[PDB]
Structures are given as C-alpha cells and as structure tokens.
Design an enzyme around this catalytic site. Structure first.
Site, PDB file in Angstrom:
ATOM      1  N   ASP A   1      36.956   1.501  27.959  1.00  0.00           N
ATOM      2  CA  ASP A   1      37.497   2.163  29.211  1.00  0.00           C
ATOM      3  C   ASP A   1      38.007   1.329  30.352  1.00  0.00           C
ATOM      4  O   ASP A   1      39.057   1.706  30.858  1.00  0.00           O
ATOM      5  CB  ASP A   1      36.013   2.870  29.843  1.00  0.00           C
ATOM      6  CG  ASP A   1      36.011   4.359  29.402  1.00  0.00           C
ATOM      7  OD1 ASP A   1      36.510   4.943  28.357  1.00  0.00           O
ATOM      8  OD2 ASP A   1      35.108   5.152  29.961  1.00  0.00           O
TER       9      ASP A   1
ATOM     10  N   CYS B   1      49.274   7.715  24.891  1.00  0.00           N
ATOM     11  CA  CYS B   1      47.988   7.416  25.311  1.00  0.00           C
ATOM     12  C   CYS B   1      48.015   8.591  26.720  1.00  0.00           C
ATOM     13  O   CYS B   1      48.054   9.614  26.300  1.00  0.00           O
ATOM     14  CB  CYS B   1      47.924   5.962  25.520  1.00  0.00           C
ATOM     15  SG  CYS B   1      49.224   5.065  26.557  1.00  0.00           S
TER      16      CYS B   1
ATOM     17  N   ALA C   1      49.392   7.864  29.954  1.00  0.00           N
ATOM     18  CA  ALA C   1      50.693   7.896  30.605  1.00  0.00           C
ATOM     19  C   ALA C   1      51.732   7.500  29.457  1.00  0.00           C
ATOM     20  O   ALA C   1      53.245   7.964  29.699  1.00  0.00           O
ATOM     21  CB  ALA C   1      50.784   6.858  31.745  1.00  0.00           C
ATOM     22  N   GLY C   2      51.339   6.888  28.302  1.00  0.00           N
ATOM     23  CA  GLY C   2      52.513   6.805  27.334  1.00  0.00           C
ATOM     24  C   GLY C   2      53.357   5.487  27.511  1.00  0.00           C
ATOM     25  O   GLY C   2      54.551   5.521  27.227  1.00  0.00           O
ATOM     26  N   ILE C   3      52.738   4.408  28.367  1.00  0.00           N
ATOM     27  CA  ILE C   3      53.445   3.165  28.323  1.00  0.00           C
ATOM     28  C   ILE C   3      52.541   1.891  28.049  1.00  0.00           C
ATOM     29  O   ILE C   3      53.193   0.908  27.723  1.00  0.00           O
ATOM     30  CB  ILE C   3      54.032   3.252  29.871  1.00  0.00           C
ATOM     31  CG1 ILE C   3      52.845   3.246  30.909  1.00  0.00           C
ATOM     32  CG2 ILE C   3      55.139   4.072  30.057  1.00  0.00           C
ATOM     33  CD1 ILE C   3      53.480   3.177  32.337  1.00  0.00           C
ATOM     34  N   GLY C   4      51.353   2.031  28.476  1.00  0.00           N
ATOM     35  CA  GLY C   4      50.238   0.881  27.976  1.00  0.00           C
ATOM     36  C   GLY C   4      49.927   0.657  26.792  1.00  0.00           C
ATOM     37  O   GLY C   4      50.575  -0.268  26.192  1.00  0.00           O
ATOM     38  N   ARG C   5      48.854   1.251  26.478  1.00  0.00           N
ATOM     39  CA  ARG C   5      48.465   1.241  25.067  1.00  0.00           C
ATOM     40  C   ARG C   5      49.658   1.534  24.032  1.00  0.00           C
ATOM     41  O   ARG C   5      49.554   0.837  22.900  1.00  0.00           O
ATOM     42  CB  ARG C   5      47.214   2.153  24.882  1.00  0.00           C
ATOM     43  CG  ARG C   5      45.985   1.647  25.505  1.00  0.00           C
ATOM     44  CD  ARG C   5      44.772   2.688  25.376  1.00  0.00           C
ATOM     45  NE  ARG C   5      43.586   2.551  26.524  1.00  0.00           N
ATOM     46  CZ  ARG C   5      42.812   3.170  26.648  1.00  0.00           C
ATOM     47  NH1 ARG C   5      42.647   4.219  25.921  1.00  0.00           N
ATOM     48  NH2 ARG C   5      42.086   3.196  27.575  1.00  0.00           N
ATOM     49  N   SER C   6      50.235   2.564  24.227  1.00  0.00           N
ATOM     50  CA  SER C   6      51.338   2.904  23.667  1.00  0.00           C
ATOM     51  C   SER C   6      52.259   1.828  23.350  1.00  0.00           C
ATOM     52  O   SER C   6      52.939   1.573  22.282  1.00  0.00           O
ATOM     53  CB  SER C   6      52.136   4.315  24.039  1.00  0.00           C
ATOM     54  OG  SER C   6      51.208   5.400  24.056  1.00  0.00           O
TER      55      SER C   6
ATOM     56  N   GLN D   1      51.314  -2.398  30.657  1.00  0.00           N
ATOM     57  CA  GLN D   1      50.925  -2.046  31.990  1.00  0.00           C
ATOM     58  C   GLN D   1      50.142  -3.055  32.840  1.00  0.00           C
ATOM     59  O   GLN D   1      50.232  -2.948  34.120  1.00  0.00           O
ATOM     60  CB  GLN D   1      49.857  -0.951  32.074  1.00  0.00           C
ATOM     61  CG  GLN D   1      50.535   0.477  31.954  1.00  0.00           C
ATOM     62  CD  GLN D   1      49.690   1.702  31.847  1.00  0.00           C
ATOM     63  OE1 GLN D   1      48.978   1.675  31.047  1.00  0.00           O
ATOM     64  NE2 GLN D   1      49.839   2.368  32.927  1.00  0.00           N
TER      65      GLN D   1
END
Ligand SMILES: Oc1ccc(CNCc2cccs2)cc1
Length: 283
Positions: A181, A215, A217-222, A262
């Site tokens: 988390d 994920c 937002a689709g920018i960090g983990r992704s 991110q």
C-alpha cells in the site's frame, strides 16, 4: 556510466531525489486537448494524468472516441504497450472495447481494487464462472473460464465475445496482488518472476496486439513494468549490454505518456529490478 555502479554511487551519495527531478525537468510536454474537453471529465480518474493527443488510443466509435490510454511504441526494442488508468464505473465498457479493437491477448493489473481503504478501480471482470458480465453500451460479454491463485499473483483465463458478430477470443488476466500500500517492494524477485510469466504466455509478442497494462493512474507501477521489460530486452539484443541507459529509455517512453515513474523510490526499484534480472537471464 554502467548501471550497477551508477546505482551504488547514487546510494552512497543519497541523490535519488535529484536524479529523479532531472528526469522530470527534461521530460517531453505535448498537448492533451481531447482529454480536457468538458464532455470527457467523467472519463478521467485524475485531472493531472492525461494521454497526449499524438499517442492516445482511439475507440472505434463516432460519438465519443476518448479513453485515458496511450500507445508506448519502443522502436529499437520492437515492443509496444498500451498504458491506461484503472477503469471507472462509467468506462468499464470502453476498456473492453479497446481490448477487443486493439487485438490484445493480455491484461496486466498491478493494483488491488481497494487499497488504503479507498477504491482504486472498478471490479471490471467476473469473479464466478456462472456469473458472466454484459457491457450493454459496447455490446460485449465477458466470462471467467479459470483462475489460478498463487502467493504473489493470480492468472485468469477470460472469454470476450463481440455480441454483434458472435466472435470470441481468449484474454489472459495477469494480476500482481502483493505491491505494498505504501512504498515499493523490498526485493524485486517476485515482480521479475511475474514479468517472466507474462512473457512466457505470448502476451508481449508481435503476433498479438499490444498488451494492456494498468494500475490506478497508469503511470507509476505501470511505468515500472514496461521500463524493466524494455531495458532487459535491449540488454539481450545489443553487442554491449552495459550501454543500456535506463534514464534515456525512461525519457524515450515519456514521449508517449506523461509521468511514467511517480517517485524516486520507484526509480530506484526499477534500477534494482533490471540489475537483478540481467543476472538471471544468463548467469
Ligand atoms: O464520474 C466521474 C466524475 C469525476 C471524475 C474525476 N474527474 C477529474 C477531473 C477533473 C477535471 C478534469 S478531470 C471521474 C469520474
């Protein structure tokens, strides 16, 4: 510089935040005018995360073709990816329309539906074989075929049917369920094992449309997922694997979608994953 020793040099000097801010300063800025039209406000999860106009995925619809999704096309590595936000209650039908129209084989999910006590995306796939889902706005039916639950991730087989033509396709759902988390994983070992499982399925291969990865937002983990994949592939392709520059690859990917990676912790974790992965690939 090489990667593993550039890594130790940033750790010893404690300069991850300064490296990461340089990337942010140098990143591309392109217009996202379609994303900001008023009619699309309820199609965006976060007002500061938008696809660029030049690389956005268009839905094959004449009314409204907009979805918060981008095509990341890596020319030297010969890999493509679609990076998108976690679906919203009013965009689950658009999401599966995109999967269908782009001929994707696999969907990669890097978040849980609830994290930190809040909803991070809609429950967009069925949880029981006998309870299928129908998306009436886009005329698709989705059925759970099988589910294999492991300690760090779950793989599901799904059937997607275009109700207009009665064509059917098998979609693989690769769900990484153990990202913490807060922060990033302590070891990249389970993330790398997950990447290799996606690879082995064929979902990343040129005989299919691009994999869809998301994920919240689709920018960090992704971003971490596609950055690690592309860098390891380039290390296999080149005569000199130490020539792979992870910061340059990231800046290339940020020509196609804003904000990839991110935090400075995510940047460091990406280095760690590529470094450890490069040893397993050989020896
Ligand atoms: O139904 C919904 C209602 C609002 C939102 C969030 N929109 C954030 C944005 C504000 C301004 C531009 S984008 C999502 C779904």
């Amino acid at each position: 510089m090489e990667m593993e020793k550039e890594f130790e040099q940033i750790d010893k000097s404690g300069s991850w935040a300064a490296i990461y801010q340089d990337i942010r300063h140098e990143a591309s800025d392109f217009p996202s005018r379609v994303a900001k039209l008023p009619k699309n406000k309820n199609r965006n999860r976060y007002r500061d995360v938008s696809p660029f106009d030049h690389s956005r995925i268009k839905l094959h619809q004449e009314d409204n073709d907009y979805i918060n999704a981008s095509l990341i096309k890596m020319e030297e590595a010969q890999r493509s990816y679609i990076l998108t936000q976690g679906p919203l209650p009013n965009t689950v039908g658009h999401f599966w329309e995109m999967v269908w129209e782009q001929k994707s084989r696999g969907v990669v999910m890097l978040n849980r539906v609830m994290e930190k006590g809040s909803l991070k995306c809609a429950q967009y796939w069925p949880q029981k074989e006998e309870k299928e889902m129908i998306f009436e706005d886009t005329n698709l039916k989705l059925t759970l075929i099988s589910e294999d639950i492991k300690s760090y991730y779950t793989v599901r087989q799904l059937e997607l049917e275009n109700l207009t033509t009665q064509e059917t396709r098998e979609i693989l759902h690769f769900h990484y369920t153990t990202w913490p988390d807060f922060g990033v994983p302590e070891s990249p070992a389970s993330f790398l094992n997950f990447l290799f499982k996606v690879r082995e399925s064929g979902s990343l291969s040129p005989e299919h449309g691009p994999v869809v990865v998301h994920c919240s937002a689709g920018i960090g983990r992704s971003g971490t997922f596609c950055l690690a994949d592309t860098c390891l592939l380039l290390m296999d392709k080149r005569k000199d694997p130490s020539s792979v520059d992870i910061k340059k690859v990231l800046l290339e990917m940020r020509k196609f979608r804003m904000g990839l990676i991110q935090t400075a912790d995510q940047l460091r974790f990406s280095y760690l994953a590529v470094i450890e992965g490069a040893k397993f690939i050989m020896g």
